[PDB]
């Protein structure tokens, strides 16, 4: 199998075993400058050259054995960047190693990085930098085999201005005054667990920390530290549960970093330092499933890794499956089923958005000539979860299936695998139930578009109240509007309010008078919970309420989580009254946006 997203030599030719990164962060030039020393191991005889991935990097020189060697940058291939061929001065035989030290500088427009001016931060006095390498942006930081089929260890030394803090996806190895420049500090990092390069991460800013667990500090700007320490207090209890499900946590520390609002994702499971959106700071811990998700990647994704992005569902399906077991052990099995059924609803939404014949609704996808950022959706998460939940029910329940999950993690730890590796092992583990497994419509589940061929069984206990109320609103006539009342919500959790809105939004538009009555009785405008507010504002805009336009524009621009920003801009563009202001607002903000978000919103808006 080929990694169609990488231009570098494949793992069948050579493999990077280690990276030693020494670099310096320059906020005036918006550059990372330094050297990347790659220890590469040949997999064949007579290896005299190799190719690495790069994207908008300037190469100063390549040094092998103290001497500068020949190298060439090829033509750029759009989102994949430019291949970099390096001439080896010695021909390598099988399993021989060499160290290649590349001197590089990043472009200020690096798609892996967002550079924030002080005005874009909470404190307003210091700038800020953060990276996002998944899926294929590590090449926009440093030259590498930018494929998850290769795993390497790394150590890093990072020079920054002394009033700023640097963190990486690794164990902190101390800080010292920069010897060459007195005003800069050097932060050291060591990652002894082999990782794919998409898990390399860097942040630099005016960061403070608070300890919330024996192996967990929360990091953020001072303005958010207190709120963050409260919101994520459950982290250690989730880690303990995750260890019961997946086996030992091998990474040492589990720190959390709360990023600026422009962070594009809800979470990123960078090893030793999960990144999360500040839109999780709801004030009541109600969005902690995101933490459970990122914790679970410490097994499914970071330890057992998809060999190419075509098999991304392995990473996300299993992680959602573990996530929902963590929340089930914390809050009960009825809650696990509630979240599982909500996930099916999100799968319905994604299939409707793409269309039921669209190739991105397949579980195993073909990313040939497809930018992974453009294909990204909830399909791998929720179709993958649905497959595992269906299998759980088919094979005798959660205790039995969790036994498989732990064996799977143990079998493929530190490796990169394909859907066939997973399925072959499922059949090996469940030897005594092969007849049961052969009842699965594997072709449909793995390779057909649209909704899965069978829907799992879901407990309805907590969902029933959401259905009742959404149906009341969907079918309401004029003589029902006065009977709605704030008491309709008295026995609904925030999770049930969110699912009520999700169910109602599936049937939007509602009549405008109905939405106005909904605000009158429920005061959803006052809710700051980002998930609820998102769905509420989508419902209002899709239902043509002009008063919601400024609220939706504000939410779309004051944070940058793509889950929220992209649909809010798309809804505003589809509403005739807000279309021009949506486009103008995007044009005015795009220079200050995260580069990937700016690209995707521009595509969405057809600018
Ligand atoms: C669907 C085919 C595309 C293959 C992967 C392509 C792009 C993915 C790029 C970055 C992914 C970062 C994922 C971090 C943790 O699972 C994410 C939870 C946050 C998700 C959200 O707010 O929707
Ligand atoms: Yb320069
Ligand atoms: Yb096979
Ligand atoms: Zn994930």
DSSP conformation letters of 563-597? HHHHHHHHHHHHSTTTHHHHHHHHHHHGGGS-HHH
Pocket residue to mutate for ligand 1, from 5, 261, 267, 276, most atoms within 8 A of Cβ: 267
Q: Which neighbouring-strand residues pair with 486?
A: none
Residue 6 belongs to some domain of the structure: no
113-116 vs 128-131, strand pairing mode = antiparallel
Neighbouring residues of 428: CB distance < 8 A, sequence distance ≥ 6: none
For residue 416, is it within any domain? yes
Strand partners, 37: 20, 101
Q: Does residue 92 line the site of ligand 1, with CB under 6 A?
A: no
Instruction: Specify the experimental method.
Output: X-ray
Q: Could you tell me how far CA 351 lies from the centroid of its own chain? A: 20
Consecutive H or E run containing 272: none
Give the 3-state secondary structure of residue 31.
strand
38 touches 102 (CB < 8 A): yes
Ligand 4 center–CA 268 separation, angstroms: 7
Calculate how far, in angstroms, residue 376's C-alpha sits from the geometric centre of ligand 1.
Answer: 6
C-alpha–C-alpha distance, residues 516 and 303, integer Å: 49
Distance CA 385, CA 305 (A): 16
Q: How many CA atoms lie within 13 A of 144 on its CB side?
A: 30
Sheet holding 71-73, edge to edge: 47-54, 82-92, 71-73
Beta bridge pairs of residue 218: 210, 256
Q: How many domains does the chain have?
A: 4
Burial of 125 per CB tally in 10 Å (0-12, 13-18, 19+) = exposed
Domain that holds residue 499: 460-607
Cβ pair 401, 395 in contact under 8 A: yes
Do the beta carbons of residue 116 and residue 108 sit within 8 Å? no
The dihedral of CA 326, 329, 333, 334: what is its sign? negative
Bridge partners, residue 317, by sequence: none
Looking at the fold, whether 76 and 172 belong to one and the same domain comes out as yes
State which of 160, 181, 205 marks the end of a domain.
205
Of the three residues 302, 318, 350, the one that is the final residue of a domain is 302
Q: Give the whole-angstrom CA distance, residue 64 versus residue 88.
A: 8
Is residue 381 part of the annotated active site? The answer reads: yes
Q: Is residue 4 part of a domain?
A: no
What's 536's domain CATH number? 1.25.40.320
User: For the packed helices 312-331 and 379-395, what is the interaxial angle rounded to 10 degrees?
Assistant: 60
Same domain (yes/no): 511, 581: yes
Residues whose CB falls within 8 Å of the CB of residue 366, separated by 6 or more in sequence, listed in order: 4, 310, 359
* DSSP states of 509-545: PPPHHHHHHHHHHH-GGG---HHHHHHHHHHHHHTT-
CA-proximal residue: ligand 1, atom 13 (nearest): 268
Q: Is 8 domain-assigned?
A: no
Q: How is residue 10 written in tokens?
A: 């494949």
Please indicate, yes or no, whether residues 453 and 493 belong to a single structural domain of this protein. Answer: no
152, 173, 205 - which closes a domain: 205
The answer to whether the CB of 105 falls within 8 A of the CB of 30 is no
- CB-based contact 206:223 (threshold 8 Å): no
Cβ-contact 387, 326 below 8 angstroms:
no
Task: Find, among 493, 315, 332, 328, the residue nearest to 388 by Cα.
Answer: 315
- Rounded CA gap, 502 and 535, in Å? 7
Cβ distance 168 to 189 under 8 Å? yes
Considering the domain architecture, whether residues 400 and 381 belong to the same structural domain is answered as yes
The answer on 465 and 455 residing in a single domain is: no
Candidates 198, 381, 408, 522; catalytic one:
381
Q: How far is the CA of 395 from the centre of ligand 4 (A)?
A: 25
Nearest of 153, 152, 137, 144 to residue 50 by alpha carbon:
144
Same domain for 200 and 263, yes or no, is: no
Burial code of 333-360, b = ≥16 C-beta within 10 A, e = fewer? eebbbbbbbbbbbbbebbbeebeeeeeb
Same domain as 191, residue 269:
no
Count Cβ atoms within 10 A of the Cβ of residue 589 and give its class: 0-12 exposed, 13-18 middle, 19 or more buried. middle
Say what the resolution is, in angstroms. Answer: 1.5
Rg of the chain in Å (alpha carbons): 25
Does residue 5 sit within a domain? no
* CATH at 246: 3.30.2010.30
Taking the C-alpha atoms of residue 214 and residue 236, their distance in angstroms, rounded to an integer, is 8
Q: Which residue has the tokens 């109602």?
A: 504
Are the beta carbons of 53 and 102 closer than 8 angstroms?
no
Give the integer Cα–Cα distance in Å for 275 and 255: 9
Question: Could you tell me the CA-to-CA distances from 211 to 85, 203, 236, 253, 280 in Å, in that order?
Answer: 45, 19, 11, 12, 18
Concatenated DSSP letters of 16-52: EEEEEEEEEEETTTTEEEEEEEEEEEE-STTEEEEEE
- Report d(CA 101, CA 38) in Å as an integer: 6
272: closest CA among 203, 362, 354, 324?
A: 203
Task: Please check whether residues 194 and 218 belong to one and the same domain.
Answer: no
| 3-class secondary-structure state, position 26 | strand
Per the CB < 8 A criterion, the answer to whether 468 and 513 are in contact is no
Give the C-alpha separation, 77 to 81, whole Å: 5
Give the full edge-to-edge strand order of the sheet including 113-116: 113-116, 128-131, 202-205, 165-168
Residues 54 and 139 in one domain: yes
CA–CA separation, 172 vs 64, rounded Å? 29
163 and 21 within one domain = yes
Q: Percent helix, strand and coil across the chain, each rounded to 5?
A: 45, 25, 35
- Asked, for residue 543, whether it belongs to a domain, the answer is yes
Identify residues whose C-beta is under 5 A from ligand 4, the ion.
316, 319
Do 40 and 107 lie in one domain? The reply is yes
Any domain includes 3: no
Which helix (H) or strand (E) covers residue 152, if one does?
A: strand 152-161
If DSSP codes are grouped into helix, strand and coil, which group holds residue 49?
strand
Distance of CA 57 from the midpoint of ligand 2 (Å)? 11
For 54, counting Cβ atoms within 10 Å of its Cβ (0-12 exposed, 13-18 middle, 19+ buried), the class is: buried
Decide: helix, strand or coil at residue 117: coil
- Within a 10 A sphere around the Cβ of 265, how many other Cβ atoms? 21
CATH number of the CATH domain containing 340: 1.10.390.10
Answer whether 205 contacts ligand 1 (Cβ < 6 A). no
Q: Give the Cα-Cα-Cα angle 109, 110, 114 (nearest 5 degrees).
A: 85
Same domain, 369 and 416: yes
Residue 481 lies in a domain: yes
Check residue 269 and report its DSSP letter.
-
Closest Cα to atom 1 of ligand 1: 376
First to last CA, the chain: 36
Say yes or no: CB of residue 10 within 6 Å of ligand 1.
no
In the residue annotation, 294 being an active-site residue is answered as yes
């Amino acid at each position: 199998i080929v990694d169609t997203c990488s231009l570098a030599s494949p793992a069948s030719v050579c493999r990077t075993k280690h990276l030693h990164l020494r670099c310096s962060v320059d906020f005036t030039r918006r550059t990372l400058t330094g050297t990347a020393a790659l220890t590469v191991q040949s997999q064949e005889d007579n290896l005299r050259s190799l190719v690495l991935d790069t994207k908008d990097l300037t190469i100063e020189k390549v040094v092998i054995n103290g001497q500068e060697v020949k190298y060439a940058l090829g033509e750029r291939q759009s989102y994949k960047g430019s291949p970099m061929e390096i001439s080896l001065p010695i021909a390598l035989s099988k399993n021989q190693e060499i160290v290649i030290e590349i001197s590089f500088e990043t472009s200020p427009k690096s798609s892996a990085l967002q550079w924030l001016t002080p005005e874009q931060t909470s404190g307003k006095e210091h700038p800020y930098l953060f990276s996002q390498c998944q899926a294929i942006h590590c090449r926009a930081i440093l030259p590498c085999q930018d494929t998850p089929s290769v795993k390497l260890t790394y150590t890093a030394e990072v020079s920054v201005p002394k009033e700023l803090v640097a963190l990486m996806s690794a164990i902190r190895d101390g800080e010292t005054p920069d010897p060459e420049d007195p005003s800069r500090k050097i932060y050291k990092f060591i990652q002894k667990v082999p990782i794919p390069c998409y898990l390399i991460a860097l942040v630099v800013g005016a960061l403070e920390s608070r300890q919330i667990g024996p192996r967990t500090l929360v990091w953020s700007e001072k303005e958010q530290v207190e709120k963050s320490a409260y919101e994520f207090s459950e982290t250690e209890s989730m880690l303990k549960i995750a260890e019961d499900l997946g086996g030992p946590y091998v990474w040492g520390q589990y720190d959390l970093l709360v990023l600026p609002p422009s962070f594009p994702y809800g979470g990123m499971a960078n090893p030793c330092l999960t990144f999360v959106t500040p839109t999780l700071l709801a004030g009541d811990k109600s969005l902690s499933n995101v933490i459970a998700h990122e914790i679970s990647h410490s097994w499914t994704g970071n330890l057992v890794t998809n060999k190419t992005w075509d098999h991304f569902w392995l990473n996300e399906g299993h992680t959602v499956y573990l996530e929902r077991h963590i929340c089930g052990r914390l809050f009960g099995e009825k809650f696990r089923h509630f979240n599982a059924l909500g996930g099916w609803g999100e799968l319905q939404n994604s299939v409707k958005t793409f269309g039921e014949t669209h190739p991105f609704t397949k579980l195993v996808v073909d990313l040939t000539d497809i930018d992974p950022d453009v294909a990204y959706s909830s399909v791998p998460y929720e179709k993958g979860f649905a497959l595992l939940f269906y299998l759980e029910q088919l094979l005798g329940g959660p205790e039995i299936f969790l036994g498989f999950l732990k064996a799977y993690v143990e079998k493929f730890s530190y490796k990169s695998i394909t859907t066939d590796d997973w399925k072959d092992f499922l059949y090996s583990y469940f030897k005594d139930k092969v007849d049961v497994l052969n009842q699965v419509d594997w072709n449909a589940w793995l390779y057909s578009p649209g909704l899965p061929p069978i829907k799992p069984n879901y407990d309805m206990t907590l969902t029933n109240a959401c259905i009742a109320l959404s149906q009341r609103w969907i079918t309401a006539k004029e003589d029902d509007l006065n009977s709605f009342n704030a008491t309709d919500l008295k026995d609904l959790s925030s999770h049930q309010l969110n699912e009520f809105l999700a169910q109602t939004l599936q049937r939007a538009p509602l009549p405008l008078g109905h939405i106005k009555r909904m605000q009158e009785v429920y005061n959803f405008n006052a809710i700051n919970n980002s998930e609820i507010r998102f769905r509420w504002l989508r419902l209002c805009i899709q239902s043509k309420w002009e008063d919601a336009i400024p609220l939706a524009l504000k939410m779309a621009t004051e944070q940058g989580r793509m889950k929220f920003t992209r649909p809010l801009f798309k809804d505003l563009a589809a509403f005739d009254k807000s279309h021009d202001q949506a486009v103008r607002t995007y044009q005015e903000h795009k220079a200050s946006m995260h580069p990937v978000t700016a690209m995707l919103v521009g595509k969405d808006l057809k600018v």
